[PDB]
Design an enzyme around this catalytic site. Structure first.
Site, PDB file in Angstrom:
ATOM      1  N   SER A   1       0.697  -1.159   0.117  1.00 29.16           N
ATOM      2  CA  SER A   1      -0.082   0.010  -0.009  1.00 29.16           C
ATOM      3  C   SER A   1       1.001   1.297   0.315  1.00 29.16           C
ATOM      4  O   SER A   1       1.777   1.304  -0.831  1.00 29.16           O
ATOM      5  CB  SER A   1      -0.892  -0.035   1.252  1.00 29.16           C
TER       6      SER A   1
ATOM      7  N   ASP B   1      -8.946  -4.910  -5.729  1.00 28.26           N
ATOM      8  CA  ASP B   1      -8.245  -3.707  -5.127  1.00 28.26           C
ATOM      9  C   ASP B   1      -9.013  -2.388  -5.204  1.00 28.26           C
ATOM     10  O   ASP B   1      -9.128  -1.899  -6.152  1.00 28.26           O
ATOM     11  CB  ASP B   1      -6.876  -3.458  -5.578  1.00 28.26           C
TER      12      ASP B   1
ATOM     13  N   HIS C   1      -8.122  -5.117  -0.491  1.00 22.59           N
ATOM     14  CA  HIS C   1      -6.956  -4.328   0.076  1.00 22.59           C
ATOM     15  C   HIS C   1      -6.927  -4.673   1.554  1.00 22.59           C
ATOM     16  O   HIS C   1      -6.977  -3.952   2.272  1.00 22.59           O
ATOM     17  CB  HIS C   1      -7.282  -2.833  -0.077  1.00 22.59           C
TER      18      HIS C   1
HETATM   19  C1  LIG Z   1      -6.654   5.149   4.210  1.00 24.52           C
HETATM   20  C2  LIG Z   1      -5.924   3.901   3.529  1.00 24.52           C
HETATM   21  C3  LIG Z   1      -4.968   4.434   2.756  1.00 24.52           C
HETATM   22  O1  LIG Z   1      -5.155   5.504   1.691  1.00 24.52           O
HETATM   23  C4  LIG Z   1      -4.106   3.324   2.012  1.00 24.52           C
HETATM   24  C5  LIG Z   1      -3.316   4.076   1.129  1.00 24.52           C
HETATM   25  C6  LIG Z   1      -3.231   3.675  -0.343  1.00 24.52           C
HETATM   26  C7  LIG Z   1      -2.259   4.073  -1.112  1.00 24.52           C
HETATM   27  C8  LIG Z   1      -1.601   5.257  -0.777  1.00 24.52           C
HETATM   28  C9  LIG Z   1      -1.490   5.697   0.681  1.00 24.52           C
HETATM   29  O2  LIG Z   1      -0.794   6.817   1.025  1.00 24.52           O
HETATM   30  C10 LIG Z   1      -2.424   5.028   1.821  1.00 24.52           C
HETATM   31  C11 LIG Z   1      -2.579   5.468   3.110  1.00 24.52           C
HETATM   32  O3  LIG Z   1      -2.978   6.747   2.743  1.00 24.52           O
HETATM   33  C12 LIG Z   1      -3.111   7.793   3.702  1.00 24.52           C
HETATM   34  C13 LIG Z   1      -2.115   8.844   3.545  1.00 24.52           C
HETATM   35  C14 LIG Z   1      -2.494   9.653   2.152  1.00 24.52           C
HETATM   36  N1  LIG Z   1      -1.219  10.477   1.905  1.00 24.52           N
HETATM   37  C15 LIG Z   1      -1.185  11.406   2.698  1.00 24.52           C
HETATM   38  C16 LIG Z   1      -0.591  10.351   1.088  1.00 24.52           C
HETATM   39  C17 LIG Z   1      -4.061  10.034   2.402  1.00 24.52           C
HETATM   40  O4  LIG Z   1      -4.139  11.049   3.295  1.00 24.52           O
HETATM   41  C18 LIG Z   1      -4.317  12.340   3.034  1.00 24.52           C
HETATM   42  C19 LIG Z   1      -4.745  12.652   1.561  1.00 24.52           C
HETATM   43  C20 LIG Z   1      -5.837  13.863   1.378  1.00 24.52           C
HETATM   44  O5  LIG Z   1      -5.777  14.234   0.085  1.00 24.52           O
HETATM   45  C21 LIG Z   1      -5.742  15.056   2.532  1.00 24.52           C
HETATM   46  O6  LIG Z   1      -6.904  15.462   2.573  1.00 24.52           O
HETATM   47  C22 LIG Z   1      -7.003  16.838   2.987  1.00 24.52           C
HETATM   48  C23 LIG Z   1      -7.674  17.111   4.552  1.00 24.52           C
HETATM   49  C24 LIG Z   1      -7.805  18.755   4.686  1.00 24.52           C
HETATM   50  C25 LIG Z   1      -6.476  18.949   4.403  1.00 24.52           C
HETATM   51  O7  LIG Z   1      -5.419  18.872   5.208  1.00 24.52           O
HETATM   52  C26 LIG Z   1      -6.025  19.123   3.059  1.00 24.52           C
HETATM   53  C27 LIG Z   1      -4.496  19.576   2.664  1.00 24.52           C
HETATM   54  O8  LIG Z   1      -5.666  17.596   2.894  1.00 24.52           O
HETATM   55  C28 LIG Z   1      -5.318  14.371   3.904  1.00 24.52           C
HETATM   56  C29 LIG Z   1      -4.916  15.254   5.041  1.00 24.52           C
HETATM   57  O9  LIG Z   1      -4.232  13.229   3.572  1.00 24.52           O
HETATM   58  C30 LIG Z   1      -4.866   9.064   2.539  1.00 24.52           C
HETATM   59  C31 LIG Z   1      -6.309   9.469   2.701  1.00 24.52           C
HETATM   60  O10 LIG Z   1      -4.545   8.282   3.773  1.00 24.52           O
HETATM   61  C32 LIG Z   1      -3.723   5.033   3.667  1.00 24.52           C
HETATM   62  C33 LIG Z   1      -0.665   6.035  -1.621  1.00 24.52           C
HETATM   63  O11 LIG Z   1       0.105   6.885  -1.141  1.00 24.52           O
HETATM   64  C34 LIG Z   1      -0.503   5.565  -3.054  1.00 24.52           C
HETATM   65  C35 LIG Z   1       0.026   6.416  -3.871  1.00 24.52           C
HETATM   66  O12 LIG Z   1       0.877   7.341  -3.617  1.00 24.52           O
HETATM   67  C36 LIG Z   1       0.332   5.964  -5.407  1.00 24.52           C
HETATM   68  C37 LIG Z   1      -0.440   4.670  -5.663  1.00 24.52           C
HETATM   69  C38 LIG Z   1      -1.372   4.247  -4.809  1.00 24.52           C
HETATM   70  C39 LIG Z   1      -1.400   4.424  -3.458  1.00 24.52           C
HETATM   71  C40 LIG Z   1      -2.066   3.895  -2.600  1.00 24.52           C
HETATM   72  O13 LIG Z   1      -2.826   2.754  -2.930  1.00 24.52           O
END
Ligand SMILES: CC[C@]1(O)Cc2cc3c(c(O)c2[C@@H](O[C@H]2C[C@H](N(C)C)[C@H](O[C@@H]4C[C@H](O)[C@@H](O[C@H]5CCC(=O)[C@@H](C)O5)[C@H](C)O4)[C@H](C)O2)C1)C(=O)c1c(O)cccc1C3=O
Length: 297
Positions: free
Chosen positions: A101, A247, A275
């Site tokens: 992930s 996924d 996932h």
């Molecule tokens: C919740 C489950 C999850 O999404 C599993 C996952 C999967 C992928 C990625 C993740 O970071 C993550 C993980 O993601 C985390 C962190 C991720 N990042 C900051 C990068 C993201 O969190 C975020 C993105 C939003 O755009 C952001 O939303 C808003 C909230 C108000 C604010 O602060 C503004 C600036 O942003 C919040 C604060 O952060 C997601 C929702 O949770 C968890 C990835 O980073 C990713 C990728 O980069 C490229 C291809 C695929 C993926 C993924 O499949």
């Protein structure tokens, strides 16, 4: 065994599985997930194929240094160096690394900037550095297409986020809540067992000193710029990309696309998988990872 390893100004909790003389396999978890995001039983299934499996808590998870992000910001550069610090902490020169992930993003950074520490690379449930993931979450919600042209996160991912915003009082409610999240994310493509996931979460909570709140620091992370994707053309360690068939966060063909960025990449698909890591897919996952690590050695 377990140990606390130093990494700059943080300390990382780590433990292992299998024979310390077998080739090193480093498990790198997704966002806001401690070591216990890798079920003990999965780590053992892997280790019992002939690997020294090492997992750890990212900073701000589990028993690793936990800090106010705003006062001490970091990015994927730090997360990747931390993974390498775990290798240093266990005396490992080169390891088969497995990124899941958000962890697959981390392992792309390892591959670019710490390539000398890799025996092989495996990535699953993830996507390429050129996928503007955060912006894509925003776009899918507003009905806009992704700028990369690949599928954005799907309804189950969004459903999972809405559950996480709902309140849970007490340990029993927290565990039930977490399991409902995983059940959503796993889908119905493979057998999901609520009792096993509940035990995995009970262990994750115990590991965090009984604290019920999920880690949240990783929501403040900024992704590497999409320019870095182009650098993956220089990676030479054997690379395996695993696509979970169903996924909901990184749907096909994200896996195929990620494999297309690395000249040594091969693609595998686990039928029915979502996932999550139900024990229904531990056998199939272990099999393909083991077959990969063997060919790289
Ligand atoms: C919740 C489950 C999850 O999404 C599993 C996952 C999967 C992928 C990625 C993740 O970071 C993550 C993980 O993601 C985390 C962190 C991720 N990042 C900051 C990068 C993201 O969190 C975020 C993105 C939003 O755009 C952001 O939303 C808003 C909230 C108000 C604010 O602060 C503004 C600036 O942003 C919040 C604060 O952060 C997601 C929702 O949770 C968890 C990835 O980073 C990713 C990728 O980069 C490229 C291809 C695929 C993926 C993924 O499949």
């Amino acid at each position: 065994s377990e140990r606390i390893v130093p990494s700059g100004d943080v300390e990382l909790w780590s433990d292992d599985f299998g024979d310390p003389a077998d080739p090193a396999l480093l498990l790198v978890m997704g966002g806001n997930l401690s070591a216990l995001g890798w079920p003990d039983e999965f780590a053992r299934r892997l280790a019992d194929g002939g690997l020294h499996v090492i997992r750890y808590d990212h900073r701000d998870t589990g028993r690793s240094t936990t800090r106010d992000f705003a006062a001490h910001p970091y990015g994927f550069g730090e997360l990747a160096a931390d993974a390498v610090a775990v290798l240093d902490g266990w005396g490992v020169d080169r390891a088969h690394v497995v990124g899941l992930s958000m962890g697959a993003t981390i392992t792309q950074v390892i591959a670019l900037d710490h390539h000398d520490r890799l025996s092989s690379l495996t990535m699953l449930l993830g996507g390429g550095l050129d996928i503007d993931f955060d912006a894509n979450i925003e776009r899918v919600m507003r009905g806009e297409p992704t700028l990369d042209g690949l599928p954005g996160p799907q309804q189950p991912f969004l459903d999972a986020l809405a559950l996480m915003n709902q309140p849970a009082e007490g340990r029993a409610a927290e565990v039930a809540k977490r399991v409902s999240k995983w059940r959503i994310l796993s889908g119905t493509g493979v057998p999901f067992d609520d009792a096993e996931y509940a035990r995995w979460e009970e262990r994750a909570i115990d590991h965090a000193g009984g604290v019920l709140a999920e880690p949240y620091a990783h929501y403040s992370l900024t992704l590497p710029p999409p320019s870095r994707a182009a650098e993956l053309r220089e990676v030479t360690v054997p690379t395996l990309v695993i696509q979970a068939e169903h996924d909901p966060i990184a749907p096909a063909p994200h896996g195929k696309h990620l494999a297309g960025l690395i000249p040594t990449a091969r693609l595998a698909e686990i039928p029915g998988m979502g996932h999550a890591l139900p024990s229904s897919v531990h056998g199939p996952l272990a099999e393909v990872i083991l077959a990969h690590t063997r060919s790289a050695a």
